[PDB]
Design a binder for this molecule. Sequence first.
Ligand SMILES: CC(C)(COP(=O)(O)OP(=O)(O)OC[C@H]1O[C@@H](n2cnc3c(N)ncnc32)[C@H](O)[C@@H]1OP(=O)(O)O)[C@@H](O)C(=O)NCCC(=O)NCCS
Length: 166
Amino acid sequence: MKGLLDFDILTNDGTHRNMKLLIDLKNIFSRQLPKMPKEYIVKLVFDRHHESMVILKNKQKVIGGICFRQYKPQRFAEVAFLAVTANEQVRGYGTRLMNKFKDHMQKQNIEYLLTYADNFAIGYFKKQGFTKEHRMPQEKWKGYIKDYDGGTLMECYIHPYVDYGN
Ligand SMILES: CC(C)(COP(=O)(O)OP(=O)(O)OC[C@H]1O[C@@H](n2cnc3c(N)ncnc32)[C@H](O)[C@@H]1OP(=O)(O)O)[C@@H](O)C(=O)NCCC(=O)NCCS
């Protein structure tokens, strides 16, 4: 594992240091992301407890990170979103999370991911493995649940025995 970067598992339990960093992630996304609905990332990022992995460009200097939580009886999952802060990206960190996200997506047994990704995260997701397009027409984008108007109903099919990292 090459890279001096530091990652951390945060939660919205309401501790203290976890919040400050968790906050960074929320603004980071909604920030670079065309004024995307803040409450959205906030909802998924602070959707009760939940688990997330951030980045640290100085041991505690948040820069990137992804947050999410899959549903068991639902067999579906939602991602708070991944993304490095503005003029902090283009360094090679974010991708480290997106992949870490997949490894976990399999450790939870949930493969039916979901989000309201826009052309921005769209291509960015389809690039890291995700799939913005589904067997059904895009016209069915409305109905993915949570958040109304903002991006596009994206999904991440976490098929079994897939080459994600393990
Ligand atoms: C997406 C991201 C994790 C990847 O960063 P990266 O691939 O290492 O490098 P980036 O190219 O993103 O670096 C930033 C610049 O590249 C562009 N860029 C942003 N996100 C990008 C991405 N996913 N892929 C390629 N280029 C991207 C931007 O124009 C940005 O311009 P600026 O910094 O001069 O204002 C990170 O750049 C980010 O958080 N961007 C904003 C959030 C976003 O787009 N989220 C959706 C993806 S899930």
